[PDB]
Structure 1
Amino acid sequence: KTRKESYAIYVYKVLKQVHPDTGISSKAMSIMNSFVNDVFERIAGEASRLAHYNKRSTITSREIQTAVRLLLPGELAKHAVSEGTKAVTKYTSAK
């Protein structure tokens, strides 16, 4: 018992959207789990400070945007920011 969370299912889904026909071993799932669990904090912690400096109290997108501009090196930043911008401005249009 004592349920645990994970990201397995979502990983598998995303996998199916690129090589729709390729399996994934067990451990190589646990890895890709831990990896997300890492990057998540490595961004959220940074954004926390970044807000705390200018003495705000809320976290919004804008900083997450900046915070990304700091960690991801170069072209990955160029892409990810476009991705975010897009995949939010849609959502706000249709709640």
Structure 2
Amino acid sequence: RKESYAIYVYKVLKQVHPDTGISCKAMSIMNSFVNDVFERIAGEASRLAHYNKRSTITSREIQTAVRLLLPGELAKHAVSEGTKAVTKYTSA
């Protein structure tokens, strides 16, 4: 009961590299990275909601936080990823 991100990072690793392992320190670094990106995007979306006098955080605020924080092709590819995930989640 430690509430980590290790199993999902492991499944993503088996998606991109099915025959590659990962050490415990590298897994801790990946968990810290996911937590850092989560709190950056959530803080930017919270600030965006407060700037526009909105009481809710929607996918638009998350999208704007992604386009604000992520640079270059990372931003547009993450927008395409999140957009098609939201489209798949809505239709079904």
Q: Same fold (TM over 0.5)?
A: yes
Distance, in Å, in 2 between the alignment partners of 1:65 and 1:6 is 25
The unaligned stretches of length 5 or more in structure 1 are none
- Cα distance per residue 1:17-45 (max 9 Å; x no partner): 11101111111111111111111001101
Q: Which residue of 2 aligns with 1:85?
A: 83
- CA root-mean-square deviation: 0.8
* Bigger helix fraction: 2
Pick aligned residue for 1:55 from 23, 47, 53: 53
Pick aligned residue for 1:65 from 63, 72, 85: 63
Q: If you compute each CA radius of gyration, which structure gives the higher value, 1 or 2?
A: 1
The unaligned stretches of length 5 or more in structure 2 are none
Q: CA deviation at 1:56?
A: 0.8
Distance, in Å, in 1 between the alignment partners of 2:16 and 2:65 is 28
Count of aligned pairs: 92
Q: CA deviation at 1:11?
A: 0.7
TM-score, normalised relative to structure 1 = 0.93
Distance, in Å, in 2 between the alignment partners of 1:77 and 1:12 is 24
- Cα distance per residue 1:35-64 (max 9 Å; x no partner): 111110011011101111111101100111
Map 1:25-44 to 2 at 5 A.
25-44=23-42
